[PDB]
């Protein structure tokens, strides 16, 4: 029942930090930006669109940090390892979380109160990267991830003992094994083991997120936003 407790606690942390309620996201699917509203976004400066997106993304990261902090055993890891795991995984989790807010039927994402396609972001001049992010969401949406599946899978995105630079690898391994067991046990219970073969190849998420963060760093170098820094040890690793 320790494993059943872990599922409960991981799902609770997810529920408290998921940002956007699934029921809201699904209900709002019909609420789509008009051609006029799309043009409005496309006409905005690259730099205004950057400010908006950067602020949304830092907020998304911060919810992922809060998620991690409420995972059993995470706070008992040394700060070095906490940072190593967050620096490697927090944005990967954000990209995974996007799939909930993505509608495969019309290739739109929920953004600033309505659904819009990737063309909403034209002013940023990142069409290939953004298309790749949308495509990643388009792939994941075919899994029809449940909320508990997202919670358990994203916990594992973070708690990965293979990240270079861990000081107490065996401590991270122990957390990882318990989370893997929780996830696999849960899939068996719900007759959802079929998703295991369909999950992203790990390299895919890594390279996509690496390219994403690279682009965020470029924008930040050219036109830095001011961040409401909630987690100084992590902030210090990403900003300079
Ligand atoms: C490279 C960047 C300059 C441009 C990235 C453009 C994206 C891919 O077009 C970004 C912009 C805003 C981003 C979203 C901002 C906040 C959220 C809430 C979070 O809970 C899930 C992801 C989600 C829904 C993001 C998904 C990707 C987005 C939708
Ligand atoms: C793996 C991680 C990637 C990433 C993290 S963590 C953070 C972040 C944010 C806030 C805090 C905090 O203390 O409140 C700590 C960390 N920003 N970020 C970015 O890619 C990013 C963004 Cl979202 C916007 C502009 C520039 C950049 Cl570089």
Swiss-Prot record:
Protein localization: Nucleus
Residues annotated as domain NR LBD: 2-240
Motif AF-2 location, chain numbering: 234-239
Result for mutant: residue 130 to N: Nearly abolishes transcriptional activity
Expressed in which tissues: Isoform 1 is widely expressed in many tissues, including liver and adipose, and highly expressed in skeletal muscle. Isoform 2 is primarily expressed in immature thymocytes.
Induction per the UniProt record: Up-regulated in the state of obesity.
Domain of life: Eukaryota
Disease the record associates with this protein: Immunodeficiency 42: An autosomal recessive primary immunodeficiency characterized by increased susceptibility to concomitant candidiasis and mycobacteriosis. Candidiasis is characterized by persistent and/or recurrent infections of the skin, nails and mucous membranes caused by organisms of the genus Candida. Mycobacteriosis is characterized by infections caused by moderately virulent mycobacterial species, such as Bacillus Calmette-Guerin (BCG) vaccine, environmental non-tuberculous mycobacteria, and by the more virulent Mycobacterium tuberculosis.
Role, per record: Nuclear receptor that binds DNA as a monomer to ROR response elements (RORE) containing a single core motif half-site 5'-AGGTCA-3' preceded by a short A-T-rich sequence. Key regulator of cellular differentiation, immunity, peripheral circadian rhythm as well as lipid, steroid, xenobiotics and glucose metabolism. Considered to have intrinsic transcriptional activity, have some natural ligands like oxysterols that act as agonists (25-hydroxycholesterol) or inverse agonists (7-oxygenated sterols), enhancing or repressing the transcriptional activity, respectively.
Record family assignment: Belongs to the nuclear hormone receptor family. NR1 subfamily.
Quaternary structure and interacting proteins, as annotated: Interacts (via AF-2 motif) with the coactivator NCOA2 (via LXXLL motif). Interacts with the corepressor NCOR1. Interacts with CRY1. Interacts (via AF-2 motif) with the coactivators NCOA1 and PPARGC1A (via LXXLL motif). Interacts (via AF-2 motif) with PROX1. Interacts with FOXP3. Interacts with NR0B2.
This protein's domain notes: The AF-2 (activation function-2) motif is required for recruiting coregulators containing LXXLL motifs such as NCOA1 and NCOA2.
Descriptive protein name: Nuclear receptor ROR-gamma
Naturally occurring in which organism (per UniProt): Homo sapiens
């Amino acid at each position: 029942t320790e494993i059943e407790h872990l599922v409960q606690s991981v799902c609770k942390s997810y529920r408290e930090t998921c940002q956007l309620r699934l029921e809201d996201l699904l209900r709002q699917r019909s609420n789509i930006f008009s051609r006029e509203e799309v043009t409005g976004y496309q006409r905005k400066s690259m730099w205004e669109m950057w400010e908006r997106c950067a602020h949304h993304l830092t907020e998304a990261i911060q919810y992922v940090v809060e998620f991690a902090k409420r995972l059993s055993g995470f706070m008992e890891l040394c700060q070095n390892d906490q940072i190593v795991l967050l620096k490697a995984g927090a944005m990967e989790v954000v990209l995974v979380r996007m799939c909930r807010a993505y509608n495969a039927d019309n290739r739109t994402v929920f953004f600033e109160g309505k659904y819009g396609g990737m063309e909403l972001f034209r002013a940023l001049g990142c069409s290939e990267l953004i298309s790749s992010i949308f495509d990643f969401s388009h792939s994941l949406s075919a899994l029809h991830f449940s909320e508990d599946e997202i919670a358990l899978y994203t916990a594992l995105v973070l708690i990965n003992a293979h990240r270079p630079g861990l000081q107490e690898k065996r401590k991270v391994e122990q957390l990882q094994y318990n989370l893997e067991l929780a996830f696999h046990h849960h899939l068996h219970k719900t007759h959802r083991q079929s998703i295991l073969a369909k999950l992203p190849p790990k390299g895919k998420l890594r390279s996509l997120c690496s390219q994403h963060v690279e682009r965020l760093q470029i924008f930040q170098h050219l036109h830095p936003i001011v961040v409401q820094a909630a987690f100084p040890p992590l902030y210090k690793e990403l900003f300079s």
